[PDB]
């Protein structure tokens, strides 16, 4: 009684969940919005021992044709999860609750993929998405990446710096902005803070960031992001659709395949020699800000790829 | 300087790490022990962009032949800044998991690769087993009271396990089906299963070969037994489906004398089973770890 042919996993307050559902309506399809954040209190899930025995809010959903996986909201530290009060109260049972929800929703998603559902970014790819492994998978498969060092050993950092030159540091998994490795950072006082957690040091590439969008082995566009350095009182970001050689396109498609993504917004960056190195493929990339500032359509191709699975 | 051919990931304070190291010593291979509990504060690991640039405490360790994967005080940190602490733990976990994934991609035979976690999600694991033709109990994961009333009405007397695992298995009694009792699961999902009246059996699998099976019948009196080659076949198949190299399975028999797979464990313990039924578990495991080094 509901057309669960296309399912958008995410909170209906997610601007990209909204963008994709609207796109899908304009094409004539009514997506089912699977908001896991309401699992224990305002949703009903029942799984039988058979992969097809899946019942959400009473209705059976054995095999959607396609799924757009915005977020499952597995940890209380994710994007769409306001879990602050609950974590301040009793963080152990809150982590327990999030793990309890995650095992069940991941079961649903994995059952769907097992049934043949085209999951646009299946959770399994998580394994390949771990950065210190992703960059090596790409590098050993022929794609250029920055000279890197993920470490907690200050001596390794000093020798890498002496080998490379200007360096940046950023998180291993993510969660903060990359900064230039300044001399202050190599003083013992603060470089010894690597014993608390490792970080990623990389060669400071001086070119321009390029965000390439890939859907089902085809590049949708390539947006160059430029920081307008002219007026310092109001720095603006100019984003421009640009043409990339077919070599770059095929490399991006190969990378998306390697990691295991259908829809991917991957960040690349050129060096002094003006050649691109792959920085990172995202598992649930955003696209709204890029569409707006660059006057391109990314949501459209995504909705069309999703609808093409139903046929 | 060190072998770094057979690597044991875990703490020296662990009994199972101890057994495995003893069995490898008694067999001729002194293994490298990756005690990741030391990772940030004490030991050091450095990864380069090339998958072989893995350096643990200064010594390059690219591509071991085999890995046995076995495995904090922060309540102050979690109440002062939980977002930051969770991110810090993710930084560490990310680097360690990266080490293991790199080795596996290099050719290393990781005994229980973390990639198996996906296939191990219980509510999906049992569906994988059944949808591939294996005998599994009739099961129901739900937070819907009407679903469990119907499930009970269809299968009969049944039992319920915690969703993710940790507690004992209990029997669903009529008193539990009342509105007051059954409503509890409106936010407390558990797993309901047809009650199997047979005897619980633990079976160990390593590299497509059953090692042993023990009925665990008062004190624990687990005793070794022998099972059909049909069920041996089914067990090794289950382990190849889930993607495990060394698994300790729980299977239970129905009233009809046929076994049903209950659950495979990512890294099952054995020090308590091999002593109580006098069979050798650590032995064949060390034999497999060493066998990988040949090729």
């Amino acid at each position: 009684n509901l057309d669960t042919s296309i399912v958008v996993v995410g909170s209906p307050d997610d601007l990209h969940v909204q963008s994709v559902t609207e796109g899908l309506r304009a094409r004539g399809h009514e997506p089912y919005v699977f908001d896991t954040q309401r699992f224990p209190e305002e949703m009903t899930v029942s799984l039988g021992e058979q992969g097809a025995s899946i019942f959400v809010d009473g209705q059976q959903i054995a095999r959607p044709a396609a799924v757009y996986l915005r977020s499952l909201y597995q940890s209380p530290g994710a994007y769409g999860v306001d879990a602050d009060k609950a974590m301040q109260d009793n963080w152990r049972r809150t982590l327990l609750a999030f793990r309890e929800r995650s095992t069940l929703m991941s079961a649903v998603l994995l059952r769907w993929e097992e049934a043949g559902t085209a999951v646009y970014n299946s959770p399994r790819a998580s394994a390949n998405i771990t950065k210190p492994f992703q960059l090596a998978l790409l590098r050993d498969a022929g794609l250029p990446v920055p000279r890197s060092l993920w470490t907690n050993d200050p001596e390794a950092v000093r020798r890498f710096h002496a080998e490379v030159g200007d360096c940046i540091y950023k998180p291993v998994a993510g969660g903060a902005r990359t900064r230039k490795l300044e001399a202050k950072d190599l003083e013992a006082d603060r470089i010894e803070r690597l014993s608390a957690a490792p970080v990623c040091f990389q060669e400071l590439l001086t070119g321009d960031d390029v965000r390439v969008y890939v859907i089902d082995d085809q590049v949708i566009c390539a947006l160059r992001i430029v920081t307008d350095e002219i007026d310092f009182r109001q720095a603006e970001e100019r984003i421009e659709a640009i043409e990339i050689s077919d070599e770059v396109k095929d490399q991006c498609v190969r990378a998306a395949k390697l990691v295991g993504l259908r829809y991917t917004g991957m960040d690349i960056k050129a060096g002094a020699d003006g050649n691109y190195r792959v920085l990172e493929l995202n598992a649930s990339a955003m696209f709204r800000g890029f569409e707006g500032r660059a006057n391109v359509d990314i949501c459209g191709p995504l909705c069309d790829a999703l609808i093409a699975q139903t046929k | 300087n060190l072998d770094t051919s057979i690597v044991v990931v875990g703490s020296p304070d662990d009994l199972h790490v101890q057994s495995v190291t003893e069995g490898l010593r008694a067999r001729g291979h002194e293994p490298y022990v990756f005690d990741t509990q030391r990772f940030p504060e004490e030991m050091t690991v450095s990864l380069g962009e090339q998958g072989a640039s893995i350096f643990v405490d200064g010594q390059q360790i690219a591509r071991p032949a085999a890995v046995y994967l076995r495995s904090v005080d922060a309540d102050k940190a979690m109440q002062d800044n939980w977002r930051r602490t969770l991110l810090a733990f993710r930084e560490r976990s990310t680097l360690m998991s990266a080490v293991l994934l790199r080795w596996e991609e290099a050719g290393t035979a990781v005994y229980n690769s973390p990639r198996a976690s996906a296939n191990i999600t219980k509510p999906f694991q049992l569906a994988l087993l059944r949808d591939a033709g294996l005998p599994v109990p009739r099961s129901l994961w739900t937070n819907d009271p009407e679903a469990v009333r119907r499930f009970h009405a269809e299968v009969g007397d049944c039992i319920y396990k915690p969703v993710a695992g940790g507690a004992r298995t209990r029997k669903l009694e009529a008193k539990d089906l009342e509105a007051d009792r059954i409503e509890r699961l409106s936010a407390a999902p558990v797993c309901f299963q047809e009650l199997l009246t047979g005897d619980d059996v633990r079976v160990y699998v390593i590299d497509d070969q059953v090692i042993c099976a023990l009925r665990i019948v008062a004190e624990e009196r687990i005793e070794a037994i022998e099972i059909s080659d049909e069920v041996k076949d089914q067990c090794v198949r289950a382990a190849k489906l889930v993607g495990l190299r060394y698994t300790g399975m729980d299977i239970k028999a129905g009233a009809d004398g046929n076994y049903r797979v209950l659950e495979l464990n990512a890294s099952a313990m054995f020090r308590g089973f091999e002593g109580r039924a006098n069979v050798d578990i650590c032995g064949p495991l060390c034999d497999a770890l060493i066998a990988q080094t040949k090729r």
Binding site: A78, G175, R190, A196, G265, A285 | N81
Partner: peptide, 17 residues
Amino acid sequence: LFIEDLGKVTTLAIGEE
């Protein structure tokens, strides 16, 4: 933390994962 601003917050620097 070496990256002190790791937890400073709706964390948006993790919105694409």
